[model samples]
Target: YGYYRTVIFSAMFGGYSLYYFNRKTFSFVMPSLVEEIPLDKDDLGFITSSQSAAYAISKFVSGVLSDQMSARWLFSSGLLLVGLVNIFFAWSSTVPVFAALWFLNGLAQGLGWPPCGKVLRKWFEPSQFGTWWAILSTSMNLAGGLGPILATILAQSYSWRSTLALSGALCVVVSFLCLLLIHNEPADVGLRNLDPMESTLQELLLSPYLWVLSTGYLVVFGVKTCCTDWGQFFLIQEKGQSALVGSSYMSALEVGGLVGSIAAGYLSDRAMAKAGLSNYGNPRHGLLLFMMAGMTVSMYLFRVTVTSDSPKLWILVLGAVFGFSSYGPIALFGVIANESAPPNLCGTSHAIVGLMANVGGFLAGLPFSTIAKHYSWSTAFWVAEVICAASTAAFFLLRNIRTKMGRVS
Candidate 1:
């Protein structure tokens, strides 16, 4: 079981990481695309906004789909679909063509995570799901750290189209690997499905707490997307940091993100164990709020440190802390949602929150962009700080909500 779990985790990790490879390939090649294609900021914004909408819908539907289907098959097919879409995306030059392919890519993008969530819930014990989920969730950050560099190298050597196409081609191989490696559940190997808390939409509708939990996700992810979209700009363009400093900020963010999620998982498991709710509990909320508060503080400090006369290295340290503080809640929210929701309805329950989280991402961009444009970068980050703190407020309401629902974990 130990060996098998490791294999499943690795496959889940590698396959999910490639989703970002395809997703972000477009970002790396943006400069070349702008230089070569007759696209403007409005067109780029429209393409991305369309993709976000497509992905949110797909994510919601796929979550429900994963619940009913063999996750191993669903996950493999989704990855293959996204890979094929990336190829088409690379092949296109026309605006409508780009729009259509990108929207399709977003739909395929929705297919990846929910099935992986199902797989994790099946194999890992509830007690340890936190650490495992957080560990795996870092695949996005890992992809972010590494994928752009790969795309940039390829684009510089060949062209943006080749770079995107290469990423798509790599994804195809990854899809094959996912099909080869992943097994549905213990039953495939003559073992029982260890955790039987299968969740369905009916359970989701009954659990009112699900709404609060899902909204909590919105609060955290909203801020996360804002940081992702604007942090680089705040430093490099606003404060005039060296490109090296910008790279360091991002590097710190990835490392901090990886560490934050893992630390939260491990810490929450211990809290769960102490409280006797090994699988789920409000106790984990302690760590969630703690991290959120820390993240808020980190956000303020980073903004000030960067905008001030402080050394760039000092800003890097804060950036690292900023990254670390922000990630735990994102992973932790999923853990709580997966466990606290009806076991049978797990995928759909998660997908609903996933949908909301993406909406939060779209919601983040315009407000942050406008605020920073109208005010100072200081004001922009203060918005982030307030949003970050607001997550803790959203989380606090959960205790009352849970007590009314009578949930122990």
Candidate 2:
């Protein structure tokens, strides 16, 4: 049984890692696509935005379905669909076809998150869930880090299309692994049911705490997606770095995010213990507010500093700080979303938040790209700064709202 648990964990982790592996392939391959397809920043941004729009729409539906259905089919089917979409995306020659294919891919990608959240709620105890959730969610960040480097290498050695095809094939293999190993609950593997205290979907959907938590998550991940999607181009065009050098710098953000996700998870868990709020709702809110404030400052610095011909070392430092601070909210957001809603409804809560956050990503892409195109890169970053600032304000507003409702410390 222990070994089965291990296998289940590995399969779930591998499943998500593969999903992100394909999702992030576009960002890394963006430069190459630009070179080959005669597209600009606005075009690339629209393509990514199209995907995000589809992802946002599907997330809620998928989240709800994950609560009622066996995640095995959802996970497997999503993988296959995303793979096919990637094949079409790779083969697409025109912008309309690229956007259409990516939109389909985004919708397929929506199936990835909620079921994984459902699995976490089932397999891990609340007392230790944060640590494990952090570890598991790192699959995305870790893959985010590796995806670009690998895609760049492949694109350099072969072609961007070949890289997409290879990634799609990898997704197919991982999807099969998910179908074979991902059980919906412990009972499927003959273990006693865990987390009997889980919340019902109705209870979760009615909770204002879920909305607050979702807003917080939306801001955090929105900033993250913006940075991940556009920061490379910003560095190259605005910071006067070469494309290769800029990509390396952007990759540093993911590396920093890897460290941040792990560190924030550990720290949030410890803080939860100290505050005696692990099972409650306020600690996460407090921690999110703190992280958002810090992230806002760092993002401001990054936007201001990147425009300068600053030393590469300083630029890297700012990038790392921005990445690390931006990522701090991710693991914590998941933990809060899981805890604030019912245990049984964890999938739905996670899906709602994840979906809302992708809306941020969708907006980040085309809107920011348009700004950068017509105005200046600094103007584009200024817009990001405003969004992060608004996120920070929202966190404080949530805190106040929670306090008024007597839900806070």
Candidate 3:
């Protein structure tokens, strides 16, 4: 068990981290690209949105298709394509080039989380899933945070072009590693698939719980994207920080997410072990509710602090605290959803989760740029505050929901 766990953990952790290395390049590289290409936020906003535009449709389709597929192939194949797209994107920077290549890269984004959720369910026992999944989830925020710092350093010393090309090459190397190592089910190593019964879409959509959880996810996800994606721009434009300083602040949000997620997961594991009595059987929600409360404060505090004078320390600290609080639901929702649905449908379940969450992301992109342009950037953060508050309300309503879904096939 230990051997299998170590290999699978490393494979998913490393493989998915590189996805961010590719995904985050656009955001981190944006200011440099703006200066070089001499484009404004609206144009770059359009460019930056390629991922969200594809998310509404592609995430749903990918979820269904990849359910019957291997975790190894899903992640490796997607990374290969995104890497290719990055190489082509680095080849040129025209609107046509940017539009075509980045849109393709967005399509490839679907390849990541669904299979990862599936793989986690396939390998680990129920009691350990929260801790294991939460630990694996850190690869996301940590890598996302790391990508910006790397891009900033490389672009500072070399050039933006070098940064793009090198990051693409790194993704390609990780893709090869993923293919070499990752596997789908424990059955590959003489164990059975966790939760072997097949699940149906009709049944899942029919559930009252999926709707409630997904809706709450909508608010949480909106807050997360706006924080991680536009955070550097906020630091630069609003706080008057340099590019390096802004990137550091932006990366801090994800770094906080990395720490918060691990701590929250362990707390949740222990919470589940105690005599916690929610109407719902699972203790995941009890721990989650407390985190969400912290999340609301963190979002508001981070927003209010955007105008601090020369306070690189505050931005970093705020970003870290906000990230830790926010990813609670986003990471552990995997465990909740896994309990709610059939084991075989893990990919589709998370895809469904991704779809709602991404709709929130799609909402975050253009409207945020528009708001920042028309009004104050801090108002945009206020908008995030409003959304975070709404998610807290939505979670309150869901307080009675089963920590795990009630039906098992």
**So what's the TM-score on candidate 2?**
0.73
Best-first order by TM-score? 1, 3, 2
Which candidate leads in lDDT? 1
lDDT of 2: 0.74
TM-score (C-alpha) between model 3 and the true structure:
0.75
Could you tell me which residue pairs clash in candidate 2? 198-343, 199-342, 199-343, 199-344
Total backbone clashes of candidate 2, pairs 3 or more residues apart or in separate chains: 4
Better of 1 and 3 by lDDT: 1
On TM-score, the candidate that comes out on top is 1
Clash pairs (backbone) in predicted model 3: none
* Residues 21-77 of candidate 3: C-alpha lDDT, one tens digit per residue: 777777787887777777766876786666667755677788888777677888889
Go through the candidates in order and give the C-alpha RMSD of each one to the true structure: 3.8, 5.4, 5.2
Comparing 1 with 3 on TM-score, the higher-scoring candidate is 1
Q: Please give the range of 10 consecutive residues that has the lowest summed lDDT in model 1.
A: 400-409
| TM, every model | 0.82, 0.73, 0.75
lDDT of each: 0.78, 0.74, 0.75
